[PDB]
A paper describes a structure:
The first patient ([name]) showed strong cardiac involvement and fibrils were isolated from a biopsy that was taken from the abdominal fat tissue. The amino acid sequence of the [name] fibril protein was obtained previously based on cDNA sequencing and mass spectrometry (MS). Comparison of the mutant patients’ sequences with the non-mutated GL segments led to the identification of six amino acid changes in the fibril proteins of patients FOR005 and [name], and fourteen in the fibril protein from patient FOR010. [name] amyloid fibrils, by contrast, are right-hand twisted. The dominant fibril morphology from each sample was structurally reconstructed to a spatial resolution of 2.92 Å ([name]) and 2.25 Å (FOR010), based on the 0.143 Fourier-shell correlation (FSC) criterion. The reconstructed three-dimensional (3D) maps were fitted with molecular models that depict polar and C1-helical fibril structures that consist of single stacks of fibril proteins or protofilaments, similar to FOR005 fibrils. The swirl is defined by the position of the central arc of the amyloid key relative to the N- and C-terminal ends of the polypeptide chain. The swirl of the key is right-handed in the FOR005 and [name] fibril proteins when oriented as shown in Fig. 3b, and left-handed in the FOR010 fibril protein. All three fibril proteins enclose a number of buried cavities, but only the [name] fibril protein contains a cavity that is lined by polar and ionic amino acid side chains and which is large enough to fit a number of water molecules. The [name] fibril contains even an additional cavity that is surrounded by hydrophobic amino acid residues. This cavity is filled with density that does not originate from the polypeptide chain, indicating that it contains a hydrophobic inclusion as an integral part of the fibril structure, similar to the previously described λ1-derived AL amyloid fibril structure from patient FOR00614.
Residue numbers in the entry:
A (entry chain C), B (entry chain B), C (entry chain A), D (entry chain D), E (entry chain E), F (entry chain F): 9 to 52, 61 to 108
Write the structure that this text describes.
């Protein structure tokens, strides 16, 4: 009569070798990530039956080195269903 | 009669080898990511039955090195359904 | 009678080898990403039954090196359905 | 008659070796991530029957080094269903 | 007649060796993560039958080094179902 | 007649060796994580039948080094079901 099934099957398989060999003297300098962000500063939404998905993301500085080598499923998601105002499924 | 099935099958398979060998002296300098962003600064949405998906993203500086070598499914998603104002599915 | 099925099958398979070998002394300099963005600065939406998808993205500086070598499904999505004002599916 | 089944099967299998060998003197300096973010500073949502998913994320500075080498499922999710205004599934 | 089954099977298997050998004198300096965030400072939601998922995250500075080498399922989740306004599943 | 079964089977198996050997004098300095966050400072939700999941997280400074090498299932979760306004499953 009714069958409601919410399933998520995530099968991730990685086979790899990361061999990193430095045989000689080296120098790395990635210094100085100081972005100055000044937003909406130093200056002189929805109604009754609705569905609203709003995202504000502010990041000053992000820096990834030698990372996420294999099968990086970070922050994975699915089927975002933002319904508003009343849902009705009916069979007669 | 009713059957509502929300499924997501993610099967990721990577087979690789990353061999990185430096046999001689080297120098790398990626310094100086200080973008100055000044937005809406230093200066003298929706109604009753609606669905609204708004995204504001501000990033000052992002820097990825030697990253995400294999099968990078980072921030993956699907079927974003932002419905507003009342949904009705009916059979007679 | 009613059957509503939201499915997403993502099957990604990569087989590769990244062999990077430097046998001699080298120098790399990618310094100086300081774009100055000044937006809407230093200066003297929708009504009742609607669906609105608005995106504002501001990035000062982005820099990817030696990244995303194989099968990069980063930020993947599908079926964005922003409905407004009331939906009705009816059979008699 | 009714069968409601919410399932999530996550099978992640990684086989890899990360061998990192430095045979010579080296120097790394990634100093200076002091982004100055000043947001909405120094300056002189939804109604009755609704579903609302709002995210505000502010990060000053994020820095990942030599991390997430294999099978990184960090912050993984699925089937976000934000329903509002009353749901009714009915069979006769 | 009714069968309601909420299941989550997470089977993670990693086999890897991280051998890190430094045979020569080295220097690493990642100092200076003091982002100054000043938000909504120094300046002169939902109604009756609804489901609302709101997240505000503020992080001053995050720094991960030599971490999450294998099978990092940190902060994993699934089937977030935020229902509001009264649910009714009925068979006759 | 009724069968309601909430199950969670988490089987994590990691086999790895982390051998870290430093044969020469070294220096590491990661000092200076003093982000100054000043939020909503120095300045001159939901109604009757609803389900609401709100998270506010403020972290001044987080720093992980040489951590979470294998099978890190820290803060793992599943099937967050925040229902509001009265649920009724009925068979006749």
């Amino acid at each position: 009569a009714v069958s409601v099934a919410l399933g998520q099957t995530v099968r991730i398989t990685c086979q790899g070798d990361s061999l990193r060999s430095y045989y000689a003297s080296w120098y790395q300098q990635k210094s100085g990530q100081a972005p100055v962000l000044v937003i909406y500063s130093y200056n002189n939404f929805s109604g009754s039956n609705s569905g609203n998905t709003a995202s504000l993301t502010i990041t000053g500085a992000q820096a990834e080195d030698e990372a996420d080598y294999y099968c990086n499923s970070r922050d994975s998601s699915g089927h975002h269903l933002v319904f508003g105002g009343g849902t009705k499924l009916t069979v007669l």
